[PDB]
Specification:
This is part of a larger assembly, with two copies of chain A, one copy of chain B and one copy of chain C. By secondary structure, chain A is mainly α. Chain A is built from one helix and no strands. Chain C is α+β, with helices and mostly antiparallel strands. The chains are: A mainly alpha, B mainly alpha, C alpha+beta. The structure holds guanosine-5'-triphosphate (GTP) and magnesium ion. Magnesium ion binds next to loops of chain D. Chain B binds a DNA duplex through helix 1, helix 4, helix 5, helix 6 and helix 7. Chain B: It comes from Escherichia coli (strain K12).
Chain lengths: 50, 277, 1340, 251
DNA sequence: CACGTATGCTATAATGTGGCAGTCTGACGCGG
DNA sequence: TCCGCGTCAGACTCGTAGGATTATAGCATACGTGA
């Protein structure tokens, strides 16, 4: 995003800074739930071949 | 290329001729008189009728294809028992046989646990009666409400509706999540745990030690009556077959063995302790 | 302020005046279902729509037909209460008037033959409760609204489908509400194709041939014209200047007498404007330029009458010569350009194998029904029944509307069937997008995502039921006699009733209401789900849809969604957001005219919002003038920047509207990371109601709204004085001004007492009014389970210190004072339900006798004569609740048992032991018992005692109704008789039974006596028939499942106190498990001697970035500081004046406090009741982004004489010495989550085993073994622990011989391993041989 | 098998076998009756369809569906995939002498110890308590031993205390990514239902006490006990097998 | 015989079938 | 040989709760076991 968050957490975010934060956050969390399957499948393949 | 079983079959039946009255009579005269060709041409010509009456009895038990085959079997009985000399048309006569055979087949194969025609038809009149009752009683009908309408026993109605209880698949997963199903919950009740199995070992082995502890004639007469050490479970009067040969002295010696063993369970620490069990 | 607010005012640190109040939170559920049952006369809605859609239907023969008149819902035979106790669905019978009309075949349409009209019952539909739930089989269930792709049109394109070429292929998709999908798409060679329901691909022009379009007409549709005049000898061309653009001039371009461009010269802007202004129309051109231009229409030689050139055919020098000599000196060719106007349809006609309309219909028919011989009848029927039949195709109003707006039409509403115009227009727009004018939409945009509430889904299933029955009806109408056959003999209820019960039951969106918390309920009903029928799958869901969309602003919460696989798809609705009439989400905004910000509010849909520029709510207003600062922060086109003040079109209504309800309850949310806040709002929902409803000191303000709107609190319908308070009920006498002139005007609210929740929590209503108190309409009369004086109370605030402690707060682990356990404040109530079923078996009926083989008198002490435990009886694991005995068949008694039973005699009785006993380790008090007996089975003595209770209790309830209603009614007649002939004490002397004979003069007041007299008698007979109904229902023998003779339900109440392993959290997503309960002596204490309740680890803050918890702690301390100061002044008893001074100065602290609260209006007594409540701690509100600032909190701390740091000197309870530095101490509002260690602790040595695999079962409820999975196996493989592994594969699992032998070895001390083969392996082999693969073991 | 409520529940194979038998026997009938060939053919197609459905349902075309819509589980499906015999019941199993509970800190514990709930340990070591009860002569028989432990008699706690001494137990946390996801400890009996974990091995388990749970496993045999004490004990397994680095590090 | 279970016959003419699926994805072979 | 259609995979433990639907005429003759 072209406009960054000028504020900090002690200062407190406004509606738009917080809304902008959300995207990255939720992408991160969704990555945890969904991508660990492919990582684990790699573990599984490795274990099976060795 | 069409590989649909249905489409291929319907294609083949399509290219076989519809008959008129005179033609049906000519063929059928020779068919009764034994003309392999005549019967086949009448069958093959009238397959299209079978399919038309096979598309009405759907979503009930078997698939369209299944009904199409049973329907065909009904049409064949119709060709075998057709009367050409009677002015009455073939299609009219065949309709009866095809509907009949299809209905009868959907009454024996439609249910995993085979229900006899009698039970099924009984149940059906209970059902149609329930529908008329619900049409005027707004709310669905009770067992007794149906029973009151037919002037019959409530237990009759109850047993029939119990039979209607339709099966659950063991493999059907529970909680929408395709995870664990009925099989993943359902125990083997018959197969006891090692806890119960080992309890019986301890029980049987404690009786061995008790048998080597009571008197020689008391554990002889006691064990062979109950069939513990003997081979067959005899009675007070039947212990006479061995060497006892007694009716009263078998009953005195049976109970004498039991009274000394009741004191053996009061001292070891059971009696009232193992009375709850 | 209101009367309930006079008792306790929350101090507000908000600064933005709230222009719009929080709407009813449970709007969606109630409006939608209201529209489903709402019988609309013209504009069909819900049921009405369903009937008009399917009906009227006719027979296959066409002679007989069924037409629909009208429907009615019967009133429910059992009310919500009786349904919940009995376990039946709360529903109304659907009775429908239907007219069987028959036509004569001899007359043309002889409608006057047989008309049979009557009212048919077909199914009961579940009714929605007052609070937007349904009661299904005695359990409250909520249907979650759905979010799906809107019907209409959609332009999309895989950005580089073939990764080798990387060429963008554009596609169109027409999505109807019901019918086949119609897809248009480009290929790499730029050929337009059409596919139906993604079937095999067809040239796009083939569909136009099915609509009867000749080649000439198709070109006339998609292409423009280039005209060629052939004059004298030279060729001439009709020119449009702005065609020859970005091109190379291939020949010498000249007109009348001026040469513009030479051969091989680039035609720029300048040349074009030159040519246009010169007014050039015709230009002479070379004949060789034509080779390659495509002719548009047909041309024939008028002389021969044969084709010179067919349409869409490339022109040559020879064709042109022959055309000239025939007599055609004008030639329409296609306008076509590689770049701007792409020749797509032209190339697609060359790929089109079809010629005429029939050829096209055949090819379409052959696609969808491949191989099957085509007929013309079949082809026409199939194509018309695809997108041109009322029956099988319907865009709906939403679909036609979105379709027309996407095609830039003017007309919103129209036909649900596709017209020829529609299809062509879509193809045209797809082609425009390929050309480069226009853009593709995106699916995540809320302008393309529609919300489908309950009523629409109920409507859909109800249509399906009608369609299934319609099949049966047409089939029976065909063979049916016309005269004997009644309409209701053809209709079946089973299919409709089955479709609807299958929706409210089998459906993913219909689930057990999450009711462990008022907030849990209210958030659950405001849930949106992208899943379930007609939706996406967890497996099928990418990441695009999941992530926060710019359109989500003010409509959907960015901060509320499960951190599971359901992460993107489940979402809570924003606060002020609402459902558009067509189903799109919309948000309120304040209209700004000429910079002046009007109080007129406008709800903008996702699509409308993009078009205006919206200022943020944080903009400083110039006191109803305009924006103070000349630059204002605004957003439009989904992106944010600075704007001038007069440029601003709109502004955010509230600071809160971006967030959902759950998140709005988080104070200082502004200082919390969105991730932690998500977890916080999700865990607040899992907060179990404690025994004592404790208000939160540090609130937001939404607390009141949530508590009241959830409806778990009893609120006053009408204001007045409370006539009678009770634990069980509340009677309020209404004021004269609100009180209707008909009835007595006394409202009676019966309060719901200790009842079971779906999470086995305890639902109890406590009265919060005093006897004889004046009450305003819409005040809280009684608090629900987690509410305090009308505010939401989900847990309990307490004294917290952030500091490490001996590792007992290691990773979020929590150290709690014994004081908290002792005060029983975190203690919770769980109501569990145990049932005992007496079934009829093959051997005979099971009995509910207390007579059970092998039971101690100790056990039978608590069972009555019937064999049911007494009410009030405390029970613990293994105690019998309901005695039950089952007939046992023959069993081969082992020779040992033959011997043993011969020793003891004690012949084991024919009856076994199936008694319901207390689950092991649960212990509680029996608070209630319910007995269901079949109609005809001899009732238990206990069932009879319970019926005595219900009957006499019922009689008392109805008696008190008629008594309070008669007293209230005559109290009015007494006042009416005074207006006219006042004899107050003289009229009351002789009896009140002989009163209504006394009249007045013939006035309106004489007519008032007549009204009160008619209603008194109305109530008199009404009381008779009500009591008869009650008595019938109490006598009514219950219809249970087949096989089941009677069922006994015991309700236990268990008191669970907090202990190590219980899960606790704040509202900032700060989790923890209790590690240790410390003695109060050991707890860190301050200089004053007051010990902390909880010690939390500060190492769980900087990493987490949830600083909300710290601000909450500082402010919570400040709140409690003011509370301690008021508490000190009340202990001293200074006087009303002094308390008033301190309290006014306190409420009006903040720099720009919005809420003013003047104590001069408050009477002295009102002040005392307020201070009395504020002594526990002064309640403060921090609105979400409009919260308290650090400055305000330090100022509040100074009013408390507490430090600015909010850190205090603390002393170690053990040593007495001080800690090395100040510790942050204050009040954090904390929650005990549903995750009790009591529910999670499990252990098993030996138990039941699975049926086929023979391995132990799963789950603690089935006494399950832990799964030792592949991953767990590998761990033992890494270690090299071979016997441990084998053990877990064999003696521990399947190996049947092994497990018993091993058990016996363990009891004999010898830990010997005696393994064999797992039975699962044996099964594997059998399964493989059942496949017909020979798999044998070759032995040694 | 019959459910309690008089209901029946059956495998899908039985529905599929019924299909095959009905069509096959109908084919025998049509052959006895000398039926015309097109009918014979349709029955042979039907037989192939039903056999194909029985062996591997969703392989050739549309899998044959139940009334639920869901495709019937065929033979091949019981060997095939995660739900199949290999992955689910054979390379990984449900296991006896296994428990699970919430975990919480035990800072007082030494590296080789773990807090084990009394009620949990009483049930996991059931047969060892019965065997010791018969050696003390406290229990006359196994039924008496069982009832003595149900009553939770004071002498039973003293016996339980005796058995768990020097007996290692396995703690496991999901997910088990490396071998240290399972470690052995000497158990320490505690009143209270949560497991107490040693802080320093929180690293290997990736365990944080925000409501994490763990599984408990009892090594039964002398061999299994020694495997646990020697190979799997937490004191014995400090260094990561991945890098030569100590995994047990203060945090 | 009865009770439970089964097979059987009926005659206006009637003669080719048709409720969901929602589109997932990056990879690796296999006929035209 | 390349496009296109097909087949194959897609982390580990815990949890919750039970459960759905339809309908097959009416009557005469035939076959096998207990009283
Ligand atoms: N297997 C699995 N683990 C999860 C899931 N969600 C969270 N976790 C784990 O639970 C833990 C929660 O966060 P923490 O472990 O506290 O994170 P951390 O590595 O300490 O990092 P900081 O919080 O920044 O100090 C992480 O280790 C995650 O790996 C999930 O869906 N599956
Ligand atoms: Mg954790």
């Amino acid at each position: 995003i072209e406009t960054p968050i000028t504020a900090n957490f002690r200062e407190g975010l406004n509606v738009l800074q917080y809304f902008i934060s959300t995207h990255g956050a939720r992408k991160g969390l969704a990555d945890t739930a969904l991508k660990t399957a492919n990582s684990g499948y790699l573990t599984r393949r490795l274990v099976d071949v060795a | 290329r069409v590989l649909d079983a249905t489409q291929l079959y319907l294609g083949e039946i399509g290219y076989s001729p519809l008959l008129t009255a005179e033609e049906e009579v000519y063929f059928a005269r020779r068919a009764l008189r034994g003309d392999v060709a005549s019967r086949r041409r009448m069958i093959e010509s009238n397959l299209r009728l079978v399919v038309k009456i096979a598309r009405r009895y759907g979503n009930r038990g078997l698939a369209l294809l299944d009904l199409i085959e049973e329907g065909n079997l009904g049409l064949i009985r119709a060709v075998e028992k057709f009367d050409p000399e009677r002015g009455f048309r073939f299609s009219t006569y065949a309709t009866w046989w095809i509907r009949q055979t299809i209905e009868r087949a959907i009454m024996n194969q439609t249910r995993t646990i085979r229900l006899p025609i009698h039970i099924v038809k009984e149940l059906n009149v209970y059902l149609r009666t329930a529908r008329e009752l619900s049409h005027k009683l707004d709310h669905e009908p009770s067992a007794e409400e149906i029973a009151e309408q037919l002037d019959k026993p409530v237990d009759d109605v109850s047993r029939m509706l119990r039979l209607n209880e339709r099966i659950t698949s063991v493999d059907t997963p529970l909680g929408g999540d395709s995870e664990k199903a009925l099989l993943d919950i359902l125990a083997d009740e018959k197969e006891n745990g090692p806890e119960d199995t080992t309890q019986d070992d301890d029980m049987k082995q404690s009786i061995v030690k008790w048998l080597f502890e009571l008197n020689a004639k008391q554990r002889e007469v006691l064990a062979r009556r109950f069939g513990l050490l003997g081979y067959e479970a005899a009675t007070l009067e039947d212990v006479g077959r061995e060497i006892g040969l007694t009716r009263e002295r078998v009953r005195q010696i049976q109970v004498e063995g039991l009274r000394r063993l009741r004191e053996i369970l009061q001292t070891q620490g059971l009696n009232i302790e193992a009375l709850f069990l | 302020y209101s009367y309930t607010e006079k008792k306790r005012i929350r101090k507000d640190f908000g600064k933005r005046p709230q222009v719009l109040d929080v709407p009813y939170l449970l709007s969606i559920q109630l409006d939608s279902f209201q529209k489903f049952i709402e019988q609309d006369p013209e504009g069909q809605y819900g049921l009405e729509a369903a009937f008009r859609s399917v009906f009227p239907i006719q027979s296959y023969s066409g002679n007989s037909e069924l037409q629909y008149v009208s429907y009615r819902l019967g009133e429910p035979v059992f009310d919500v209460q009786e349904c919940q106790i009995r376990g039946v669905t709360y529903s109304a019978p659907l009775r429908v008037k239907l007219r069987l009309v028959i036509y004569e075949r001899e007359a043309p349409e002889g409608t006057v033959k047989d008309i049979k009209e009557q009212e048919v019952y077909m199914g009961e539909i579940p009714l929605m409760t007052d609070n937007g739930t349904f009661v299904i089989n005695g359990t409250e269930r909520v249907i979650v609204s759905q979010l799906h792709r809107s019907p209409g049109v959609f332009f999309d394109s895989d950005k580089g489908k073939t990764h080798s070429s990387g060429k963008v292929l554009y596609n169109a998709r027409i999505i109807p509400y019901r019918g086949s999908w119609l897809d248009f798409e480009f290929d790499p060679k730029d050929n337009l194709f059409v596919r139906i329901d993604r079937r095999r691909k067809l040239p796009a022009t083939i569909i136009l041939r099915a609509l009867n379009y000749t080649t000439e007409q198709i070109l006339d549709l998609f292409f423009e014209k280039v005209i060629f005049e052939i004059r004298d000898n030279k060729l001439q061309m009709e020119l449009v200047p702005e065609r020859l653009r970005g091109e190379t001039a291939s020949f010498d371009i000249e007109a009348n007498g001026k040469v513009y461009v030479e051969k091989g010269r680039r035609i720029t802007a300048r040349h074009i404007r030159q040519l246009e202004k010169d007014d050039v129309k015709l230009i002479e051109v070379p004949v060789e330029y034509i080779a390659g231009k495509v002719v548009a229409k047909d041309y024939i030689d008028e002389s021969t009458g044969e084709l010179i050139c067919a349409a869409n055919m490339e022109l040559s020098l020879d064709l042109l010569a022959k055309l000239s000599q025939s007599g055609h000196k004008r030639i329409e060719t296609l306008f076509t350009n590689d770049l701007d106007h792409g020749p797509y349809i032209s190339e697609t006609l060359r790929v089109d194998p079809t010629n005429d309309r029939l050829s096209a219909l055949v090819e379409i028919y052959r696609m969808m029904r491949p191989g099957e011989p085509p007929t013309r009848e079949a082809a026409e029927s199939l194509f018309e029944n695809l997108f041109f039949s009322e029956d099988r195709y319907d865009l709906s109003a939403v679909g036609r509307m979105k379709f027309n707006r996407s095609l830039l039409r003017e007309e919103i509403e129209g036909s649900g069937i596709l017209s020829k115009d529609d299809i062509i227009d879509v193809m045209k727009k797809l082609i425009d997008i390929r050309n480069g004018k226009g853009e593709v939409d995106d699916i995540d945009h809320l302008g393309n995502r529609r919300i489908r509430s309950v009523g629409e889904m109920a409507e859909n299933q109800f249509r399906v039921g009608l369609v299934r029955v319609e099949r049966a009806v047409k089939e029976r109408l065909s063979l049916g006699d016309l005269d004997t056959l009644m309409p209701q003999d053809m209709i079946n209820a089973k299919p409709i009733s089955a479709a609807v019960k299958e929706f409210f039951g089998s459906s993913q969106l219909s689930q057990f209401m999450d009711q462990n918390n008022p907030l849990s309920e209210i958030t659950h009903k405001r849930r949106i789900s992208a899943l379930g029928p007609g939706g996406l799958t967890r497996e099928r869901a990418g990441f695009e849809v999941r992530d926060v969309h710019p359109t989500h602003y003010g409509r959907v919460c960015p901060i509320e969604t499960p951190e599971g696989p359901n992460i993107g798809l489940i979402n809570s609705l924003s606060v002020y957001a609402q459902t558009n009439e067509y189903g799109f989400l919309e948000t309120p905004y304040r209209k700004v005219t000429d910079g002046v910000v009007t109080d007129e509010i406008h709800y903008l849909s996702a699509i409308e919002e993009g078009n205006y520029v919206i200022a943020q709510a944080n903009s400083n207003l110039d006191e109803e003038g305009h924006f103070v600062e000349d630059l204002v922060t605004c957003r439009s086109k989904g992106e944010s920047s600075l704007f001038s003040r007069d440029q601003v079109d709109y502004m955010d209504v509230s600071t809160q509207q971006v967030v959902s309800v759950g998140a709005s309850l988080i104070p200082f949310l502004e200082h919390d990371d969105a991730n932690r806040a998500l977890m916080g709002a999700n865990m607040q929902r899992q907060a179990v109601p404690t025994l004592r409803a404790d208000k939160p000191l540090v609130g937001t303000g939404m607390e009141r709204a949530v508590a009241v709107d959830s409806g778990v609190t009893a609120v006053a319908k009408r204001g007045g004085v409370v006539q009678y308070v009770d634990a069980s009920r509340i009677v309020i006498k209404v004021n004269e001004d609100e009180m209707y002139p008909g009835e007595a005007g006394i409202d009676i609210y019966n309060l719901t007492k200790y009842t079971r929740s779906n999470q086995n929590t305890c639902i109890n209503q406590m009265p919060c009014v005093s006897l004889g108190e004046p009450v305003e309409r819409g005040d809280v009369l009684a608090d629900g389970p987690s509410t305090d004086l009308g505010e939401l109370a989900l847990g309990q605030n307490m004294r917290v210190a952030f500091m490490p402690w001996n590792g007992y707060n290691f990773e979020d682990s929590i150290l709690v004072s014994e004081r908290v356990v002792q005060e029983d404040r975190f203690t919770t109530i769980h109501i569990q339900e145990l049932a005992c079923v007496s079934r009829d078996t093959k051997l005979g009926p099971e009995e509910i006798t207390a007579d059970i083989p092998n039971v101690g008198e100790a056990a039978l002490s608590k069972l009555d004569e019937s064999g049911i435990v007494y009410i009030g009886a405390e029970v613990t694991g293994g105690d019998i609740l309901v005695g039950k005995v089952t007939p046992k068949g023959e069993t081969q008694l082992t020779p040992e048992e033959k011997l043993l039973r011969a020793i003891f005699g004690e012949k084991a009785s024919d009856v076994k032991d199936s008694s319901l006993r207390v689950p092991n380790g649960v212990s509680g008090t029996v608070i209630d018992v319910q007995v269901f007996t079949r109609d005809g089975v001899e009732k238990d003595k206990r069932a009879l005692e319970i019926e005595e209770m219900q009957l006499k209790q019922a009689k008392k309830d109805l008696s008190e109704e008629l008594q309070i209603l008669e007293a209230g009614l005559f109290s009015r007649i007494r006042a009416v008789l005074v207006a006219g002939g006042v004899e107050a004490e003289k009229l009351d002397k002789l009896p009140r039974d002989r009163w209504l004979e006394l009249g007045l003069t013939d006035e309106e007041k004489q007519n008032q006596l007549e009204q009160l007299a008619e209603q008194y008698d109305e109530l008199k007979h009404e009381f008779e028939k009500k009591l008869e109904a009650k008595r019938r229902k109490i006598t009514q023998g219950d219809d249970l499942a087949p096989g089941v003779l009677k069922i006994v339900k015991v309700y236990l109440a268990v008191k669970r106190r907090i202990q190590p392993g219980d899960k606790m959290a704040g509202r900032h997503g700060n989790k923890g498990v209790i590690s240790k309960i410390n003695p109060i002596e050991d707890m860190p204490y301050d200089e004053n001697g007051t010990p902390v309740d909880i010690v939390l680890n500060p190492l769980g803050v900087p990493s987490r970035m949830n600083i909300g918890q710290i601000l909450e702690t500082h402010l919570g301390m400040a709140a409690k500081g003011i509370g301690d100061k008021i508490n000190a002044m009340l202990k001293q008893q200074q006087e009303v004046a002094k308390l008033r001074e301190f309290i006014q100065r306190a409420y009006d602290l903040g720099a720009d406090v919005r809420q003013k609260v003047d104590l001069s209006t408050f009477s002295d007594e009102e002040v005392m009741r307020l201070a009395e409540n504020l002594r526990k701690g002064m309640p403060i509100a921090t609105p979400v982004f409009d919260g308290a600032k650090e400055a305000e909190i330090k100022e509040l701390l100074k009013l408390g004489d507490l430090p600015t740091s909010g850190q205090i000197r603390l002393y170690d309870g053990r040593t007495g010495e001080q800690f090395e530095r100040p510790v942050t101490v204050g009040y954090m509002y904390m929650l005990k989550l549903n995750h009790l260690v009591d529910d999670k602790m499990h252990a098993r040595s030996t138990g039941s085993y699975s049926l086929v695999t023979q391995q132990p079962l799963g789950g603690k409820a089935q006494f399950g073994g832990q799964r030792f999975g592949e991953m767990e196996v590998w761990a033992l493989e890494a270690y090299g622990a071979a016997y441990t592994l084998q053990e877990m594969l064999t003696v521990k699992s399947d190996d049947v011989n092994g497990r018993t032998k091993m058990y016996k070895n363990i009891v004999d001390g010898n830990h010997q391993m005696e393994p064999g083969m797992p039975e699962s392996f044996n099964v594997l082999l059998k399964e493989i041989r059942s496949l017909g693969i020979n798999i044998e073991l070759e032995d040694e | 098998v019959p459910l309690d409520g008089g209901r029946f529940a059956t495998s899908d194979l039985n529905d599929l076998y019924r299909r095959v038998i009905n069509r096959n026997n109908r084919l025998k009938r049509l052959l006895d009756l000398a039926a015309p060939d097109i009918i014979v053919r349709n029955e042979k197609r039907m037989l192939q369809e039903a056999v194909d459905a029985l062996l591997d349902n969703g392989r050739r075309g549309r899998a044959i569906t139940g009334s639920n819509k869901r495709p019937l589980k065929s033979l091949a499906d019981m060997i095939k995939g995660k739900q199949g015999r290999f992955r689910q019941n054979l390379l990984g199993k449900r296991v006896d002498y296994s428990g699970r509970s919430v975990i919480t800190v035990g800072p007082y514990l030494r590296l080789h110890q773990c807090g084990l709930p009394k009620k949990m340990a009483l049930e996991l070591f059931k047969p060892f308590i019965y065997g010791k009860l018969e050696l003390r002569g406290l229990a006359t028989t196994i039924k008496a031993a069982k009832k003595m432990v149900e009553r939770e008699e004071a002498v039973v706690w003293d016996i339980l205390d005796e058995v768990i001494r020097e007996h290692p137990v396995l703690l496991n946390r999901a997910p088990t990514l490396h071998r240290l996801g399972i470690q052995a400890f000497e158990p320490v009996l505690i009143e209270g239902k949560a497991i107490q974990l040693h802080p320093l091995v929180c690293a290997a388990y990736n365990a944080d006490f925000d409501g994490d749970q763990m599984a408990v496993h009892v090594p039964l045999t002398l061999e299994a006990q020694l495997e646990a004490r020697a190979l799997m004990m937490s004191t014995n397994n400090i260094l990561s097998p991945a890098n030569g680095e100590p995994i047990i590090v203060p945090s």
